[PDB]
Design a protein around this ligand. Sequence first.
Ligand code: FES
Length: 141
Amino acid sequence: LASIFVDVSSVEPGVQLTVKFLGKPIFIRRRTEADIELGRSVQLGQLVDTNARNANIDAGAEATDQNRTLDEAGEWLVMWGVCTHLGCVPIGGVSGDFGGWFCPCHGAHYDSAGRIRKGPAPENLPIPLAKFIDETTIQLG
Ligand code: FES
């Protein structure tokens, strides 16, 4: 019975909701049109980590923008807010050099799809088991 159910009905574009799950933060960002476009503009060959790190799809899936969001429209980016270096909480609100998150502990930069682009972190921020169960609610777990 671990699953939790997050009401995202009030999350506007450019807002991140942070919820605690299994003791750690989950970031739920409703991405802006700029975030989405920028995420879709990155070639796989440009990425540090080409694996989607996404619990919801094949473990060998490529880290395309489309394989990083819950929805086809790419508005809903849900990920563990746990830096893949040493587990600090990355700072969002379009921070760092790649329009995403910056981990101030040792300077990891993640892009607008949560993919690692610069710094000592080895992997893209992982995506939890997560799905919409209706228009307004994301089940985590
Ligand atoms: S814990 Fe994030 S860069 Fe080291």
